[PDB]
């Protein structure tokens with residue numbers, strides 16, 4: 001439904017804007033899935049116990065379905081950016097979406113490398129909080145942006161996507177793979193993939209932080225939205241973590257500590273608020289363009 | 290609105306499917322905008338005549354606005370792929386969209402390198418066919434997919450996007466930059482950018498070809514759709530080319546021949562049909578999955 005082109009504006013694009021800096025970062029730090037050596041993970045995998053394989057398969061399942069979900073569910077944000085006339089942010093989000101596709105790809109390649117070929121949905125059957133987040137909260141909230149690209153809708157969506165799903169859940173998951181792999185010096189392919197996905201995620205989270213901060217600065221009502229949505233989801237995220245532990249008698253393999261993981265995740269969620277609240281009362285110019 | 294996850298299916302993803310082969314290709318052949326040396330183009334640029342700069346600025350304007358448009362307008366196709374349950378195609382399209390963003394980026398960097406900072410919309414004022422394609426036909430047709438992800442809607446959208454805008458117009462534009470730059474051995478940064486964008490475009494067009502072929506094979510009614518939409522747009526594309534020549538008295542700089550360019554573009558459009566018509570009557574298995 002088009003009238004003008006952002007790329008043709010006087011002065012061009014502002015390469016110093018956050019989304020364009022992130023885009024350039026993603027270009028400089030682009031990594032190739034074909035560069036990750038998976039040829040050693042199967043040997044480690046076969047040496048694990050049944051329980052250890054079960055746990056790691058279930059963690060992997062949660063990951064790859066989550067990547068897939070974000071790949072799909074990020075799309076309405078691109079639409080919102082277009083509605084706001086923010087080409088640089090739209091550009092950034094194309095990279096974001098591509099990266100999530102590539103995350104989906106690399107987990108799939110790891111699964112293939114370790115010999116996993118069965119339907120994995122069964123690993124989500126007993127994780128109702130997971131399904132509530134990834135099959136309901138995330139798509140429903142993101143999809144709202146198609147009809148309502150308002151600052152309030154953006155903030156709600158960014159909380160769900162960037163601050164909870166990435167900021168709380170994915171980071172806690174990376175910590176889980178850390179606990180599984182590092183001290184035992186196993187699964188070097190997984191380890192490498194997690195490092196690289198982590199690196200991409202740093203940018204995705206920077207974008208989400210930026211997005212909430214600029215709306216918060218512009219209108220303190222958006223702080224309301226932020227705080228409310230965070231407080232709604234933190235317990236649901238924590239329930240996901242709890243349900244996962246419960247399936248293993250709260251004593252999973254790899255010596256994972258339920259209390260450690262709840263503390264970690266809580267910290268990750270809690271630390272989010274401060275990072276946004278600092279935008280309150282700031283000239284939007286100090287935050288944006 | 291989610292129920293299952295494609296990434297969790299028995300047997301995983303099919304790495305041999307066309308969209309996944311293209312995705313892997315795009316990963317292997319990823320190019321960095323920061324690798325293109327632009328530091329020599331300004332010197333060449335300043336040696337051109339006013340007329341030559343005018344013509345090339347207008348060609349560049351058409352390009353970068355077109356990249357921007359496709360970056361934006363590809364999005365509804367991702368939605369259609371999701372509706373069809375085709376995760377591999379969705380994945381591919383994230384890469385496609387990212388690449389168009391990066392195309393937009395690199396043309397913007399070239400403009401900056403040559404010292405162009407004015408608002409460029411004025412270069413489109415006298416190109417009404419351009420505006421009709423890029424501001425009306427392309428967004429309207431693509432946007433239809435949001436509400437109607439049917440095979441017929443997909444085919445119409447793919448004709449507009451892949452077969453006309455890329456297949457006919459962009460290819461003719463690459464030929465224009467070839468005529469401008471190669472024999473004179475100028476603008477090595479432009480030349481390099483055009484080669485790299487060309488390489489990405491080969492994949493985008495492969496995807497569009499695949500998409501039309503699989504719907505055509507599945508139902509010959511989709512051949513109707515294809516043929517009709519092509520025949521509707523070819524004259525509009527040719528009018529775009531004509532209007533561009535007319536502004537320069539049908540004798541632009543760089544010794545460009547109107548008749549040569551009309552023949553080239555016509556050939557590019559015409560050659561499209563055969564590539565799709567061969568899918569008629571074929572088992573879809575010979576074309577897809």
Ligand SMILES: CCCCCCCCCCCCCC(=O)O
Pocket residue numbers: 059062063066067070100103165166169170172173176201204241244261
């Ligand atoms: C004890 C560990 C429980 C950790 C929870 C695992 C859930 C994985 C969430 C995946 C989200 C991916 C989102 C993204 O890539 O941006």
Ligand SMILES: CCCCCCCCCCCCCC(=O)O
Pocket residue numbers: 348351352355356359389392454455458459461462465490493530533550
């Ligand atoms: C005599 C030359 C006239 C050529 C027409 C120039 C129009 C440029 C179209 C740009 C389309 C970009 C689409 C894409 O990148 O996929």
Ligand SMILES: [Fe+3]
Pocket residue numbers: 070100166201204
């Ligand atoms: Fe992410």
Ligand SMILES: [Fe+3]
Pocket residue numbers: 359389455490493
């Ligand atoms: Fe393209």
Ligand SMILES: [Mn+3]
Pocket residue numbers: 067070099100103197201
């Ligand atoms: Mn990810």
Ligand SMILES: [Mn+3]
Pocket residue numbers: 356359388389392486490
């Ligand atoms: Mn392009």
